[PDB]
Amino acid sequence: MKNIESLFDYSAGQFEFIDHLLTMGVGVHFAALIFFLVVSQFVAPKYRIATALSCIVMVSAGLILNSQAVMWTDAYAYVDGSYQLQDLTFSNGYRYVNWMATIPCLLLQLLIVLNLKGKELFSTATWLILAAWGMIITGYVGQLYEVDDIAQLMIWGAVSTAFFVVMNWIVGTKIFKNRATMLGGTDSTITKVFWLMMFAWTLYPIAYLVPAFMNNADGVVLRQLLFTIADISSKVIYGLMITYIAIQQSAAAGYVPAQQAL
Ligand SMILES: CCCCCCCC/C=C\CCCCCCCC(=O)OC[C@H](O)CO
Ligand SMILES: *C/C=C(C)/C=C/C=C(C)/C=C/C1=C(C)CCCC1(C)C
Ligand SMILES: CCCCCCCC/C=C\CCCCCCCC(=O)O
Ligand SMILES: CCCCCCCC/C=C\CCCCCCCC(=O)O
Ligand SMILES: [Br-]
Ligand SMILES: [Br-]
Ligand SMILES: [Br-]
Ligand SMILES: [Br-]
Ligand SMILES: [Br-]
Ligand SMILES: [Br-]
Ligand SMILES: [Br-]
Numbered sequence: 001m002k003n004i005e006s007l008f009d010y011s012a013g014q015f016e017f018i019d020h021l022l023t024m025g026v027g028v029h030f031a032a033l034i035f036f037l038v039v040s041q042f043v044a045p046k047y048r049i050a051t052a053l054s055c056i057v058m059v060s061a062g063l064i065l066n067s068q069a070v071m072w073t074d075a076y077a078y079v080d081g082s083y084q085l086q087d088l089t090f091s092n093g094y095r096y097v098n099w100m101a102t103i104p105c106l107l108l109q110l111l112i113v114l115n116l117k118g119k120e121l122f123s124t125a126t127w128l129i130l131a132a133w134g135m136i137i138t139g140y141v142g143q144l145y146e147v148d149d150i151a152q153l154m155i156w157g158a159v160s161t162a163f164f165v166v167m168n169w170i171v172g173t174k175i176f177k178n179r180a181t182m183l184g185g186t187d188s189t190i191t192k193v194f195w196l197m198m199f200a201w202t203l204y205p206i207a208y209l210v211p212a213f214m215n216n217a218d219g220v221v222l223r224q225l226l227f228t229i230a231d232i233s234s235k236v237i238y239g240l241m242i243t244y245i246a247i248q249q250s251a252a253a254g255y256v257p258a259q260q261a262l
Pocket of ligand 5 (some may be wrong): 012013
């Protein structure tokens, strides 16, 4: 009731497009899961946790997308030419709770391939996860108001954006100060990962603001489209680049299965 999805009836085309976006997302993540599983054997032990974290992200995201898909079809029924709300079973909040889990995994695998270790790894990961959780929690509270109090959505979103900016400053600083440690030419690749991250993660706050500038059924569809683009880019494409960096550094470090795989 606190999300704009509950305010509208949906045409068959809108309803089925959203359903298909979610089910396609399930398939893409679970297909990627198998890929990350199989290639982990070609990653040196020092970096293998990075590929395992991608497996965890894939199944976490895939399970939540699958839950959303079923909740979507549970909540609406085709009545008198449109899909109409029948039950209070759909909200975007499950995405937020999930981010609490997937964002730390995405950040940790970056720090691993940057060759951080020991106290700097633990300390950097701690500040980053705290900043990320602050961002997610304040965003979560904000979107509880996307129907009733747009002013409060904006203020919680400004607080959330402050955490986001500080998080990105930490990430960028560690990347640019440590890329000279990277092997196999991946000092060039990691800079592209950072820019991919900036692009993909910024799509989420744009989706968060849809209720302010497109409060109608097509805005609901656009938000799910943006989430889909952002999810694939921030989790799947990002994970593929992290895995490439892990294998390339594994090979440059003399790990034979990595060398043969490449
Ligand atoms: C809610 C309103 C708040 C509005 C606030 C607007 C400020 C945005 C400016 C920068 C964002 C920081 C993004 C992080 C970019 C990377 C920075 C970095 O990596 O620094 C390089 C380092 O200094 C070299 O070694
Ligand atoms: C796979 C999911 C990812 C990488 C989620 C990332 C989410 C964000 C970067 C969220 C950012 C937000 C803001 C900066 C302000 C508005 C509220 C959020 C939480 C959507
Ligand atoms: C309040 C929340 C704080 C959460 C802090 C999280 C701490 C995570 C610390 C680092 C995890 C590293 C574990 C994997 C080791 C990889 C090193 C390697 O195998 O080469
Ligand atoms: C239970 C798991 C959550 C772990 C939280 C620990 C990390 C803390 C990070 C920043 C907290 C930001 C506080 C925002 C809460 C105010 C919203 C409200 O209470 O209405
Ligand atoms: Br239609
Ligand atoms: Br239509
Ligand atoms: Br190793
Ligand atoms: Br997720
Ligand atoms: Br179905
Ligand atoms: Br490259
Ligand atoms: Br939201």
